[PDB]
Scaffold this motif. Structure first.
Motif, PDB file in Angstrom:
ATOM      1  N   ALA A  79      13.555  22.223  29.045  1.00 11.74           N
ATOM      2  CA  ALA A  79      14.622  22.311  28.063  1.00 11.74           C
ATOM      3  C   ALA A  79      14.569  21.121  27.111  1.00 11.74           C
ATOM      4  CB  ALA A  79      15.975  22.370  28.770  1.00 11.74           C
ATOM      5  N   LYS A  80      14.618  21.406  25.809  1.00 12.32           N
ATOM      6  CA  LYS A  80      14.807  20.376  24.800  1.00 12.32           C
ATOM      7  C   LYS A  80      15.765  20.886  23.736  1.00 12.32           C
ATOM      8  CE  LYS A  80       9.878  19.067  24.913  1.00 12.32           C
ATOM      9  NZ  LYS A  80       8.664  19.101  24.060  1.00 12.32           N
ATOM     10  N   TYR A  81      16.566  19.966  23.199  1.00  9.89           N
ATOM     11  CA  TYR A  81      17.462  20.309  22.103  1.00  9.89           C
ATOM     12  C   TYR A  81      16.688  20.633  20.829  1.00  9.89           C
ATOM     13  CZ  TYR A  81      20.645  17.894  25.299  1.00  9.89           C
ATOM     14  OH  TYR A  81      21.359  17.492  26.405  1.00  9.89           O
ATOM     15  N   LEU A  82      15.604  19.905  20.569  1.00  9.89           N
ATOM     16  CA  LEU A  82      14.722  20.119  19.436  1.00  9.89           C
ATOM     17  C   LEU A  82      13.462  20.838  19.886  1.00  9.89           C
ATOM     18  CD1 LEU A  82      14.978  19.133  16.372  1.00  9.89           C
ATOM     19  CD2 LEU A  82      16.491  17.944  17.949  1.00  9.89           C
ATOM     20  N   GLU A  90      20.391  12.758  23.018  1.00 15.69           N
ATOM     21  CA  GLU A  90      19.932  12.821  24.405  1.00 15.69           C
ATOM     22  C   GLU A  90      20.490  11.708  25.287  1.00 15.69           C
ATOM     23  OE1 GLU A  90      17.672  13.314  21.998  1.00 15.69           O
ATOM     24  OE2 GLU A  90      17.056  15.408  22.251  1.00 15.69           O
ATOM     25  N   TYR A 130      13.152  14.394  31.634  1.00 17.77           N
ATOM     26  CA  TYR A 130      13.168  14.984  30.301  1.00 17.77           C
ATOM     27  C   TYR A 130      12.020  14.464  29.450  1.00 17.77           C
ATOM     28  CZ  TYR A 130      14.647  15.983  25.515  1.00 17.77           C
ATOM     29  OH  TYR A 130      14.694  16.391  24.205  1.00 17.77           O
ATOM     30  N   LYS A 180      14.242  27.280  12.792  1.00 18.35           N
ATOM     31  CA  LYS A 180      15.673  27.156  13.059  1.00 18.35           C
ATOM     32  C   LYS A 180      16.469  28.084  12.156  1.00 18.35           C
ATOM     33  CE  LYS A 180      18.382  24.175  11.378  1.00 18.35           C
ATOM     34  NZ  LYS A 180      19.206  23.017  10.938  1.00 18.35           N
ATOM     35  N   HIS A 181      16.068  28.183  10.889  1.00 16.90           N
ATOM     36  CA  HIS A 181      16.608  29.223  10.027  1.00 16.90           C
ATOM     37  C   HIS A 181      16.193  30.609  10.494  1.00 16.90           C
ATOM     38  CE1 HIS A 181      16.926  25.836   6.993  1.00 16.90           C
ATOM     39  NE2 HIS A 181      18.140  26.355   6.993  1.00 16.90           N
ATOM     40  N   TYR A 210      20.136  16.161  16.792  1.00 21.29           N
ATOM     41  CA  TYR A 210      20.182  16.326  18.238  1.00 21.29           C
ATOM     42  C   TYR A 210      19.148  15.467  18.945  1.00 21.29           C
ATOM     43  CZ  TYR A 210      23.623  20.057  18.891  1.00 21.29           C
ATOM     44  OH  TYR A 210      24.791  20.783  18.977  1.00 21.29           O
ATOM     45  N   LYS A 211      18.204  14.879  18.211  1.00 22.36           N
ATOM     46  CA  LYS A 211      17.267  13.964  18.846  1.00 22.36           C
ATOM     47  C   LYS A 211      17.845  12.567  19.041  1.00 22.36           C
ATOM     48  CE  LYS A 211      13.863  15.369  20.879  1.00 22.36           C
ATOM     49  NZ  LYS A 211      13.915  15.169  22.355  1.00 22.36           N
ATOM     50  N   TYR A 233      12.164   7.846  16.415  1.00 24.59           N
ATOM     51  CA  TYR A 233      11.776   7.728  17.811  1.00 24.59           C
ATOM     52  C   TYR A 233      11.916   6.305  18.324  1.00 24.59           C
ATOM     53  CZ  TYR A 233      10.458  12.381  19.111  1.00 24.59           C
ATOM     54  OH  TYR A 233      10.501  13.710  19.447  1.00 24.59           O
ATOM     55  N   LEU A 282      24.093  12.947  25.610  1.00 23.66           N
ATOM     56  CA  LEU A 282      24.359  14.230  26.244  1.00 23.66           C
ATOM     57  C   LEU A 282      23.894  14.269  27.696  1.00 23.66           C
ATOM     58  CD1 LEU A 282      23.989  17.069  23.623  1.00 23.66           C
ATOM     59  CD2 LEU A 282      25.997  15.957  24.601  1.00 23.66           C
ATOM     60  N   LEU A 283      22.664  13.837  27.969  1.00 22.65           N
ATOM     61  CA  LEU A 283      22.186  13.857  29.347  1.00 22.65           C
ATOM     62  C   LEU A 283      22.810  12.778  30.223  1.00 22.65           C
ATOM     63  CD1 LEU A 283      19.336  14.683  27.478  1.00 22.65           C
ATOM     64  CD2 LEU A 283      18.730  15.255  29.822  1.00 22.65           C
ATOM     65  N   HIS A 289      10.720  19.641  19.122  1.00 25.34           N
ATOM     66  CA  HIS A 289       9.932  18.519  18.638  1.00 25.34           C
ATOM     67  C   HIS A 289       9.981  17.389  19.650  1.00 25.34           C
ATOM     68  CE1 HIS A 289       7.964  15.661  16.098  1.00 25.34           C
ATOM     69  NE2 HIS A 289       8.031  16.429  15.025  1.00 25.34           N
ATOM     70  N   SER A 290       8.816  17.025  20.177  1.00 23.14           N
ATOM     71  CA  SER A 290       8.669  15.858  21.027  1.00 23.14           C
ATOM     72  C   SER A 290       7.766  14.873  20.302  1.00 23.14           C
ATOM     73  CB  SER A 290       8.107  16.230  22.401  1.00 23.14           C
ATOM     74  OG  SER A 290       7.020  17.128  22.274  1.00 23.14           O
ATOM     75  N   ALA A 291       7.480  13.745  20.953  1.00 21.31           N
ATOM     76  CA  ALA A 291       6.580  12.756  20.370  1.00 21.31           C
ATOM     77  C   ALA A 291       5.163  13.307  20.246  1.00 21.31           C
ATOM     78  CB  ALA A 291       6.597  11.476  21.207  1.00 21.31           C
ATOM     79  N   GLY A 333      20.412  23.615  19.753  1.00 17.65           N
ATOM     80  CA  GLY A 333      21.262  23.660  18.569  1.00 17.65           C
ATOM     81  C   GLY A 333      22.593  24.292  18.897  1.00 17.65           C
ATOM     82  N   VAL A 383      10.098  23.177  11.501  1.00 16.82           N
ATOM     83  CA  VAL A 383      11.278  23.299  12.346  1.00 16.82           C
ATOM     84  C   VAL A 383      12.465  23.752  11.512  1.00 16.82           C
ATOM     85  CG1 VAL A 383      10.441  21.688  14.082  1.00 16.82           C
ATOM     86  CG2 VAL A 383      11.717  20.814  12.109  1.00 16.82           C
ATOM     87  N   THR A 401      26.932  17.209  27.606  1.00 15.72           N
ATOM     88  CA  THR A 401      26.547  18.109  28.686  1.00 15.72           C
ATOM     89  C   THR A 401      25.257  17.653  29.368  1.00 15.72           C
ATOM     90  OG1 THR A 401      25.407  20.234  28.990  1.00 15.72           O
ATOM     91  CG2 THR A 401      25.933  19.577  26.717  1.00 15.72           C
ATOM     92  N   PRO A 402      25.384  17.005  30.525  1.00 18.10           N
ATOM     93  CA  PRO A 402      24.203  16.598  31.293  1.00 18.10           C
ATOM     94  C   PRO A 402      23.682  17.670  32.238  1.00 18.10           C
ATOM     95  CG  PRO A 402      26.145  15.740  32.352  1.00 18.10           C
ATOM     96  CD  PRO A 402      26.633  16.557  31.168  1.00 18.10           C
ATOM     97  N   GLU A 461      18.306  32.437  13.546  1.00 15.37           N
ATOM     98  CA  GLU A 461      19.505  33.181  13.189  1.00 15.37           C
ATOM     99  C   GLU A 461      19.167  34.547  12.611  1.00 15.37           C
ATOM    100  OE1 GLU A 461      22.737  32.408  13.670  1.00 15.37           O
ATOM    101  OE2 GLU A 461      22.071  30.651  14.804  1.00 15.37           O
ATOM    102  N   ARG A 466      -0.435   5.052  21.716  1.00 17.01           N
ATOM    103  CA  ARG A 466      -1.235   5.618  20.640  1.00 17.01           C
ATOM    104  C   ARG A 466      -1.119   4.729  19.411  1.00 17.01           C
ATOM    105  NH1 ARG A 466       0.203  11.903  19.852  1.00 17.01           N
ATOM    106  NH2 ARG A 466       2.296  11.052  20.242  1.00 17.01           N
TER     107      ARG A 466
END
Lengths: 100, 185, 75, 142, 141, 66, 144, 55
Positions: B33-36, D49, D111, B81-82, D45-46, D78, D52-53, B38-40, B8, B77, B1-2, B85, D121
């Motif tokens: 929007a992010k699926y997680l 991307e 994104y 995530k738990h 899910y990481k 990553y 999916l995208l 968590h980013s860098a 989740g 996370v 899905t783009p 629900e 870094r």
RNA sequence: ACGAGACUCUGGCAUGCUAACUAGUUACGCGACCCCGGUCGGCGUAACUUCUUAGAGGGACAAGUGGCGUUCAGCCACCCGAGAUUGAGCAAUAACAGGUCUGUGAUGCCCUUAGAUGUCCGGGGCUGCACGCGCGCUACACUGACUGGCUCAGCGUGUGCCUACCCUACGCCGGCAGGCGCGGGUAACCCGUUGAACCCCAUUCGUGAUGGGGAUCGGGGAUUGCAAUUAUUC
């Protein structure tokens, strides 16, 4: 016939110029030459106290030895390399020729 | 899905942001929007690079607390995530909407400070900083020496915060701080 | 300080208070049913594994650290 | 047919993830094991991307064998993101036009910029007189 | 058709434990019931046939990288030696509990010795290992 | 905090008072000019000196400089 | 199975030592002196005794089947390096004590050190650290 | 008689069997890389053996 | 004129240049295994420098725009961008009764110099404990402990002129510490593809000084050393 010559030194300008000058004597006879392999450098690490006794604030040191090495292969007999290993050598470079 | 994103299995859409005072400091929709959660990283370098962060990631960024659990984002996370629900199986609605009413209702408007105290207004970014914070340490004692796990206490409080039922830590400390400011105001 | 004297094994009324009343809750986890019915956490998980074979709770997330349960589907 | 070989490298904090693409069918696997079969499996899910995208159809003509080495757990996770997203960019540059390739960069730019621009870094050096890079030892007065 | 690399490793280490249930001829040692896995541990494990579990992990590790000897087995199966009052160090496994697995899998032909030392997997052991790799994948599809 | 010192500024005027026609407006143009008409020892100074020249060129085209 | 059975037990006064009935078997035995956790699991292994149950289901005639292993582990093929008293000083009897002999044998090695005027035993008389601990800065609570 | 009670200790190990070559003391010895020299004798002669405080 | 700056080493970007049978890849060709394809640090080969490594270079300047500023020095913002402040080193004038005669064959001066404050050998102490203080470590638990499984690194070092003393794979013996036999590494080679923890997954415990905590202390076993009792460690 496959002879290997080691090029190891401390000063980067002392080892880079003698590796290329030894290449210059190789193409004149136009023989089977190999290029310079640059292995990763060894750095000796010493960090010690600045103060003789144990008084004062605590300050340390950063002594370094970034030593470098290069190897060159040749499919050449031991005779013609002995006419090249007698010319263009700076005393800061350590050479050990490997006959076989 | 783009085109659409699923957190989740949670939908991106249908979260109306109630307060207009915080909607410029809740980055939760259609650009964020992010699926997680968590980013860098990178969000904590500039002065106002904290304004466009996804709020669910902000709570996990504030959850890894008290020594032993610092630098353990891999499991917090696994807590939220738990815990998402747990909100859904109590409400049936969008659990992220409960968080929207949680950060809205747990941010103090006026706050005394060392000036003799002068009660002054706060920034919306200060307000989202405190609202996310007071609940984040409130559940930190609810699971402390208790059979109730950290996943439930994280989920139990914002449920009690979205209705302002005053049985959570974050609601109590908001209205007392608004009242002790109301003393020297 | 204050003793939380949890039940190590069920009684004939407590387990009978489990076969009907637990399927009425919307939130069933080993951390609340052990606190609401005063049993250990070990007995809490071991009170729901049979309910899987009894089909009176629905599993939607089992994990190392967290397992949750609910009613069944309403129909 | 023609050897359509793309091997794109992409670094991370220390982690090195290098791809090797070819004109294949819809299979993506890193070191032989597939991308969902990498632990920790909370970051599943990481690694979707780029799946999916972009959609699965971008990988209908693409197989990728990814060699990864070095770094940490999350650092590898990553590294294996920005090393295959970059790889399909070069495969959609050497072999197809960039108008079908800028349509999959503009999606990649809104994104996350980590997928094409790595992190500069690097962990700072611990000095003497302190347990960390900035932290110094606890001072005692008197 | 798929290999072991297409299967999640968590539900693989008990799959190879199930194939040794029909065998019962690995000549399992005698002191297995009263032994600790390593010096960094202090208890015994929970499953009764944990020796059917740790042996089940060796063959897939010998699938990934072979020529591994007795000193290379204790490193992987080791763990954090939680020293308690002191900060911890890392600790390898026990030498014998690795030596009795590579002697259990020399009783039945499933492993061979590599030239210049080591322990690596055999092709006919790669025949039936690619049969339990199908029973996991075909069941979850 | 990016304030140039004398050696950035006393040198850049010698670039202008002797070489006006040999320069242009773009930085990388007269960066590549100043390497050959001036022996600057380092690279970072080579970007430093020419950087003040283009900024003063933005003044000379706009007005007189002391 | 799940509910409290009949013949339920809360306290097993075995070898004149109280053992609680609430825990698991392999961890309730730690109440007895001379048995910790590691010695407790293996003795439960030297007979086919279930240990995924609590200490309140195990039948009576086989808790004595536990005991026949307890004081005498030798004839049930338990090695010497599990024992808390290996190579006894008088007889060389590799034995295992359980809450009766442990404190009983404990007031013997005192006088096997105290009568002989040994440096190890003299510190036990004073109550100081004997294993070579720095005493200047630590151990302040017990001594005033 | 005499000679068997003057150097009769085993002198192949320990810190009484090692010393500096320049300072000739038994403290702070750099026994790394075969230096065998005290850490204060190391400072003044750091240039003579060739080291540079590069960092 | 010095110091600041500049400068140095490192950190980040250059599918461009130079080349690597002690660096890696790409193929090709078998071997193995599953249903042409799939996998392999299994095994060889010719093309490559993507990854390996380090050599030269190139790249950032408040450079471009927009405000702001004497429209000067400059500052704030945007975009392009791997970087729109990486980190350290070096670091003056003058000064302290700062510290070191326990770093010296750096030393003035003083004490001692054969029944020696010189030297060595034995053993003890520097660890000694009513008490106060400093830097620390592990903890006080359920975001946990405990037990299996799964899986990721980057800095270094290694056979000693003396030196008689190394780093270690592999093969067995033993629960472990440890022990025995072969082989390689003076090292990008062997160790080592350095299979680190945290971690992740799944058990078990269940708010209990409990399976948190590991202080104290008894019993047995091995290593190093000539020698460990005041327990060298394990």
């Amino acid at each position: 016939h496959r002879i290997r010559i080691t090029l190891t030194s401390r000063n980067v300008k002392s080892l880079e110029k003698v590796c290329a000058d030894l290449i210059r004597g190789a193409k004149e006879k136009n023989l089977k030459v190999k290029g310079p392999v640059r292995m990763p450098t060894k750095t000796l690490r010493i960090t010690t106290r600045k103060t003789p006794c144990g008084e004062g604030s605590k300050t340390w040191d950063r002594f370094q030895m970034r030593i470098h090495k290069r190897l060159i292969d040749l499919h050449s007999p031991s005779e013609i390399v002995k006419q090249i290993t007698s010319i263009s050598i700076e005393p800061g470079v350590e050479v050990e020729v490997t006959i076989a | 899905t783009p085109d659409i994103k699923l957190f989740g299995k949670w939908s991106t859409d249908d979260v109306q942001i109630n307060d207009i005072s915080l909607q410029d400091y809740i980055a939760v929709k259609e650009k964020y929007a992010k699926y997680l959660p968590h980013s860098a990283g990178r969000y904590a370098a500039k002065r106002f690079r904290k304004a466009q962060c996804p709020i669910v990631e902000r709570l996990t960024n504030s959850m890894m607390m008290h020594g032993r659990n610092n630098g353990k984002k891999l499991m917090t996370v696994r807590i939220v995530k738990h815990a998402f629900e747990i909100i859904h199986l109590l409400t049936g609605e969008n659990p992220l909407q409960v968080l929207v009413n949680a950060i809205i209702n747990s941010g103090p408007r006026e706050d005394s400070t060392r000036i003799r105290r002068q009660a002054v207004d706060v920034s919306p970014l200060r307000r989202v900083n405190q609202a996310i914070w007071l609940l984040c340490t409130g559940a930190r004692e609810a699971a402390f020496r208790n059979i109730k796990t950290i996943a439930e206490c994280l989920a139990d409080e914002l449920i009690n915060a979205a209705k302002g039922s005053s049985n959570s830590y974050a609601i109590k400390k908001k209205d007392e701080l608004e009242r002790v400011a109301k003393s020297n105001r | 300080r204050d003793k939380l004297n949890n039940l190590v094994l069920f009684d004939k009324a407590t387990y009978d208070k489990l076969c009907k009343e637990v399927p009425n809750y919307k939130l069933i986890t080993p951390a609340v049913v052990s606190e609401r019915l005063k049993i250990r956490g070990s007995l809490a998980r071991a009170a729901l594994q049979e309910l899987l074979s009894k089909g009176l709770i629905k599993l939607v997330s089992k994990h190392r650290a967290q397992v949750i349960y609910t009613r069944n589907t309403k129909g | 047919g023609p050897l359509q070989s793309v091997q794109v490298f992409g670094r991370k904090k220390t982690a090195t993830a290098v791809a090797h693409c070819k004109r294949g069918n819809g299979l993506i696997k890193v070191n032989g094991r597939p991308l969902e079969m990498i632990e920790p499996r909370t970051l599943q899910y990481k690694l979707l991307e780029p799946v999916l995208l972009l959609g699965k159809e971008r990988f209908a003509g693409v197989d990728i064998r990814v060699r990864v080495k070095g770094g940490g757990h999350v650092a590898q996770i990553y590294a294996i993101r920005q090393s295959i997203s970059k790889a399909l960019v070069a495969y959609y540059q050497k072999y197809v036009d960039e108008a079908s390739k800028k349509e999959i960069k503009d999606i990649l730019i809104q994104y996350d910029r980590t997928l094409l621009v790595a992190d500069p870094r690097r962990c700072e050096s611990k000095k003497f007189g302190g347990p960390g890079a900035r932290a110094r030892y606890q001072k005692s007065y008197r | 058709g798929v290999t072991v690399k297409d299967v999640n490793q968590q539900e693989f280490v008990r799959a190879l434990a199930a194939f040794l249930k029909k065998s019962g001829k690995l000549k399992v040692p005698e002191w297995v019931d009263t032994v600790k896995l390593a010096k960094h541990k202090e208890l015994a494990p929970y499953d009764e046939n944990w020796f059917y579990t740790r042996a089940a992990s060796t063959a897939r590790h010998l699938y990934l990288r072979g020529g591994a000897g007795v000193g290379s087995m204790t490193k992987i199966y080791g763990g954090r030696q939680r020293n308690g009052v002191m900060p911890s160090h890392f600790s390898r496994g026990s030498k014998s509990v690795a030596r009795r697995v590579l002697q259990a899998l020399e009783g039945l032909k499933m492993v061979e010795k590599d030239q210049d030392g080591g322990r690596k997997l055999t092709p006919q052991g790669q025949r039936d290992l690619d049969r339990i790799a199908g029973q996991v994948a075909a069941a979850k599809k | 905090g990016r304030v140039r010192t004398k050696t950035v500024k006393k040198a850049a005027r010698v670039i202008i008072e002797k070489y006006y026609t040999r320069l242009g407006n773009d930085f990388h143009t007269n960066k590549r000019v100043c390497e050959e008409i001036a022996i600057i020892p380092s690279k970072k100074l080579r970007n430093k000196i020419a950087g003040y020249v283009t900024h003063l060129m933005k003044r000379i085209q706009r007005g007189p400089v002391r | 199975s799940l509910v409290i059975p009949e013949k339920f037990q809360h306290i097993l006064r075995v070898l004149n030592t109280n053992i609680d009935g609430r825990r698991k078997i392999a961890f309730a035995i730690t109440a007895i002196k001379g048995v910790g956790r590691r010695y407790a699991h293996v003795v439960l292994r030297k007979a086919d005794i279930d240990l995924t149950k609590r200490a309140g289901e195990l039948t009576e005639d086989e808790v004595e089947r536990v005991i026949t292993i307890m004081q005498n582990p030798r004839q049930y093929k338990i090695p010497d390096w599990f024992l808390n008293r290996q190579k006894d000083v008088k007889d060389g009897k590799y034995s295992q004590v359980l809450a009766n002999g442990l404190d009983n044998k404990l007031r013997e090695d005192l006088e096997r050190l105290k009568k002989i005027r040994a440096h190890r035993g003299l510190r036990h008389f004073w109550g100081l650290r004997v294993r070579g601990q720095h005493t200047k800065t630590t151990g302040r609570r017990g001594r005033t | 008689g005499h000679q068997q009670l003057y150097w009769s200790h085993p002198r192949k190990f320990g810190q009484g069997s090692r010393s500096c070559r320049v300072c000739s003391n038994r403290h702070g010895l750099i026994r790394k890389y075969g230096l065998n020299m005290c850490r204060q004798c190391f400072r003044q002669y750091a240039k003579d053996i060739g080291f540079i405080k590069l960092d």
